[PDB]
Design a protein around this ligand. Structure first.
Ligand SMILES: C[C@H](N)CC(=O)OP(=O)(O)OC[C@H]1O[C@@H](n2cnc3c(N)ncnc32)[C@H](O)[C@@H]1O
Ligand SMILES: [Cl-]
Length: 488
């Protein structure tokens, strides 16, 4: 209590000093359900730290963490955080190719996966280990670090999330976001927060901070369940979840095929949170009706600050509302609307480019200062301070009451399975296939690319599909290729 909380693990474990016996994270012990309590979570966390802290690792050395969200994964990140080892979450569904690209660029001292983890193939240069309820065990010792660093500063890295582009987030950035979000009273200490995102998104951490920072319980939702809407609803039933967080699309199956079962949870679920994509209004209304007690909140923003705004979906949604609002920044934040020349937009209803100023901003992109300098630009409203501000690439306009409406992107960034895809990079790659002169990508959800053959060339459908995968991930592969004579 005498100790001020300026680091990630010190924040998420406050419940271990105030409410030690409260259940912190739901956890399956074989087939017998249990709960890890704030105190127990803290013990696993330090049990892990002891195993880690004797390995010669310096503060700043990176560690890869391969797991679905679970109490042991939280323990691992807590431990990493306790040692100033920034951590890189990765989800077990991750393609070999993609993982070793992350390992390669971030050059971590150590890789760790779940007890059950069936991963192999890591460089001998990289330490290897495992974790679960029974403890943390190292297999291949990591090379020791410099033995030079001595204290963890709020500006130091806490974690990095990878799109390969890593967003590097300090201890402060993540605590300002946590402090912004909790100011909204989305949840209480009796809440059971069902977390759906993959551990490799940002969103998982948002879920964990929401629950733990509110004294609540994290309910890890096994992702398997998303393609079995009934099994997914029974899971929410039996876990007795009261808050459910996820991309809008987690609800699609249940609203479409299982609305009766879902509405059987209507008395227990008091909140639902979404970010990433807009929620289509038909479905939002459906969900409001199936869950009549639920406060539905639209979380808008970006990994580069986790997020920015939390905005209540009105109940019911007025009939001629085509878009939900994204509100205004949480306390201590501001999304400024600027024009093309960075001049402020003061007129309501005029679209502008959101520039975010907060205590939450990413430190930079890993090993990519040029991108970092394009994203965190000097503050156009007051550039002489030295202060930097985040050029989001998102457009919006404000109404006369001061609320924001998302107008889409200024570039061609798109979302596919929640992963940021720049459509111009699909186009460029397709265009470097021989016999293609130009391409145009577009989303309809499905990704199509339209292509204009160079003069003379014959064109092989599948040869392109495969050629794209050579350097584009699976979510960036076209599902539909259409040849044309020319391009409008
Ligand atoms: C918690 C998580 N980090 C949120 C997120 O989506 O992270 P990120 O992968 O970094 O997505 C960035 C973009 O998604 C879009 N977005 C984001 N939330 C919304 C929204 N609620 N409505 C509409 N568009 C949105 C905006 O384009 C954002 O610029
Ligand atoms: Cl704002």
């Amino acid at each position: 209590a005498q100790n001020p909380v300026e680091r990630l693990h010190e924040f998420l474990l406050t419940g271990a000093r105030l409410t030690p016996e409260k259940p912190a994270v739901l956890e399956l012990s074989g087939t017998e359900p249990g709960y890890v309590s704030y105190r127990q979570l803290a013990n696993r966390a330090e049990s892990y730290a002891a195993a880690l802290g004797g390995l010669g690792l310096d503060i700043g050395d990176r560690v890869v963490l391969e797991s679905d969200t679970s109490a042991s994964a939280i323990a691992a990140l807590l431990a990493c955080s306790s040692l100033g080892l920034p951590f890189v979450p990765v989800t077990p569904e991750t393609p070999a190719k993609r993982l070793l690209a992350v390992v390669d660029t971030v050059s971590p001292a150590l890789y760790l996966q779940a007890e059950g983890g069936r991963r192999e193939g890591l460089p001998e240069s990289v330490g290897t280990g495992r974790f679960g309820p029974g403890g943390l065990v190292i297999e291949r010792a990591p090379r020791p670090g410099r033995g030079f660093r001595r204290e963890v500063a709020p500006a130091d890295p806490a974690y990095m999330v990878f799109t390969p582009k890593g967003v590097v987030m300090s201890h402060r950035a993540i605590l300002s976001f946590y402090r912004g979000m909790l100011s909204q009273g989305i949840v209480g200490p009796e809440s059971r927060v069902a977390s759906t995102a993959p551990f490799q998104f940002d969103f998982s951490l948002l879920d964990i901070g929401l629950a733990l920072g509110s004294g609540a319980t994290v309910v890890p939702v096994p992702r398997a369940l998303l393609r079995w809407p009934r099994r997914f609803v029974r899971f929410l039933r039996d876990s007795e979840a009261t808050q459910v967080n996820g991309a809008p699309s987690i609800w699609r199956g249940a609203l479409r095929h299982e609305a009766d079962e879902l509405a059987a949870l209507g008395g227990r679920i008091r909140g639902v949170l979404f970010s990433g994509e807009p929620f289509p209004l038909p479905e939002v209304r459906a969900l409001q009706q199936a869950l009549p007690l639920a406060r539905i909140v639209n979380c808008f923003g970006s990994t580069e600050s986790v997020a920015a705004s939390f905005t209540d979906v009105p109940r019911p949604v007025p009939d001629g509302l085509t878009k939900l609002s994204i509100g205004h920044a949480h306390p201590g934040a501001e999304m400024m609307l600027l024009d093309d020349d960075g001049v402020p937009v003061t007129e309501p209803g005029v679209t502008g480019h959101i520039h975010l100023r907060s205590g939450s901003l990413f430190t930079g992109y890993w090993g990519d200062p040029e991108a970092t300098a394009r994203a965190l630009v000097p503050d156009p409203t007051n550039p002489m301070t030295g202060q930097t501000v985040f050029r989001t690439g998102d457009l919006a306009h404000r109404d006369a009451t001061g609320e924001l409406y998302f107008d889409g992107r200024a570039d061609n960034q798109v979302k596919i399975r929640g992963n940021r895809v720049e459509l111009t990079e699909v186009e460029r790659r397709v265009a470097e296939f021989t016999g293609v002169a130009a391409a145009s990508a577009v989303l309809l959800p499905v990704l199509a690319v339209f292509v204009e053959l160079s003069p003379g060339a014959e064109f092989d459908e599948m040869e392109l599909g495969a050629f794209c995968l050579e350097e584009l991930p699976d979510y960036m592969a076209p599902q539909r290729i259409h040849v044309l004579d020319a391009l409008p």
